[PDB]
Amino acid sequence: HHHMSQEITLGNIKIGGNNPVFIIAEAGLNHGGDLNLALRMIDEAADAKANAIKFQAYNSEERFGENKEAVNLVKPAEFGKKEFLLLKERSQKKNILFFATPFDVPNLNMLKEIGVEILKIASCDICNITLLEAAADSGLIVILSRGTASASEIETAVSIFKKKKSPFILLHCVSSYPMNEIDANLSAIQTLKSKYEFPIGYSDHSKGIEIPLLAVASGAEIIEKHYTVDRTLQGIDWEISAEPKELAKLVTETERIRKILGHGKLEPQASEQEEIEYRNSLRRK
């Protein structure tokens, strides 16, 4: 390629540059607070060969305030340090990366204390200056999604991490539920890749995997997709969540599209040598 993002390398973490697309299974709140179900989600995400599985670390009242129905809905799905330690341990055993989205500073501090190496910051927090500054100060790798955000809002958020030289990844994202095809605006990925030097990816909220695969073809270097072991359980966000076989197809189809994208250099392929020989023998005149 011409454009190559500055890769983020932390041990075996290798994101951007000419590395494989980093695929995140967003378990989110779909486990409903069932710890055994969350552990099962890790097992089956590792079997699907996702690179990482992501959870959410939040206080319901802090997150939703006076929306009593939202509070009651997400209250059962809260996990604390003891559960996140068990989930991190199962993830290490199954060779899949564990991390989570903190929604406040106490949860961020807890995630750093249990040894996570990556933080996700949700789209709704792209203007949460206190939380962004705490993420930048942590020194950890930060993935920020830009759903809801204008170009100026993105620049303000990006500057917070540039100022601390945080390893930083930005995901194009549309905070629409569910996200329709005509709202994907996947060419924003290239707009961001032209504007910034760090890796750009895509976080999906559609009802399938076609849009994230198209996002890979349009340049995404990271893919985040909501994830469930079984939509029939009707857990939180089930409608936009991929089941394990669909996650596995996302992984293998991403690899296939990456092969099709190729090296990006302006040079002939060896499969063209017969036409090169013909060109050189008769058409140079």
Report the nearest approach of a copy of itself to the CB of residue 216 (Å).
Answer: 9
Query: Which C-beta is closer to a copy of itself: that of 133 or that of 230?
Result: 133
Report the nearest approach of a copy of itself to the CB of residue 232 (Å).
Answer: 26
Report the nearest approach of a copy of itself to the CB of residue 233 (Å).
Answer: 25
Q: Does the annotation flag 263 for ligand binding?
A: no
CB-CB neighbours of 183 under 10 Å: 13
- The reply on whether position 280 binds a copy of itself by CB under 8 A is yes
Binder among 9, 72, 92, 150 for a copy of itself (CB under 8 A)? 150
**Count of residues interacting with a copy of itself (CB under 8 A):** 71
- The reply on whether position 209 binds a copy of itself by CB under 8 A is no
Q: Whose CA is closest to 141, among 29, 51, 5, 14?
A: 14
* Strand ranges in 193-267 using DSSP code E only, listed in sequence order: 200-204, 222-226
d(CA 271, CA 264): 16
DSSP string of 66-135? T-HHHHHHHGGG---HHHHHHHHHHHHHTT-EEEEEESSHHHHHHHHHTT-SEEEE-GGGTT-HHHHHHH
Query: Which C-beta is closer to a copy of itself: that of 105 or that of 248?
Result: 105
Query: Which C-beta is closer to a copy of itself: that of 81 or that of 256?
Result: 256
Report the nearest approach of a copy of itself to the CB of residue 27 (Å).
Answer: 20
Binder among 65, 76, 80, 115 for a copy of itself (CB under 8 A)? 65
- The reply on whether position 276 binds a copy of itself by CB under 8 A is yes
Q: Which of residues 95-124 bind a copy of itself (CB under 8 A)?
A: 123-124
CB-CB neighbours of 13 under 10 Å: 17
Do you find a cis peptide bond into 20, omega within 30 degrees of 0?
no
| Rounded CA Rg of the chain | 20
* 124 token code pair: 């709704």
Give the x/- contact pattern for a copy of itself in 176-195, rule: CB under 8 A.
xx-xxxxxxxxxx-xxx-xx
Q: Which residues are annotated as a binding site for Mn(2+)?
A: 205, 226
- What are the binding residues? 205, 226
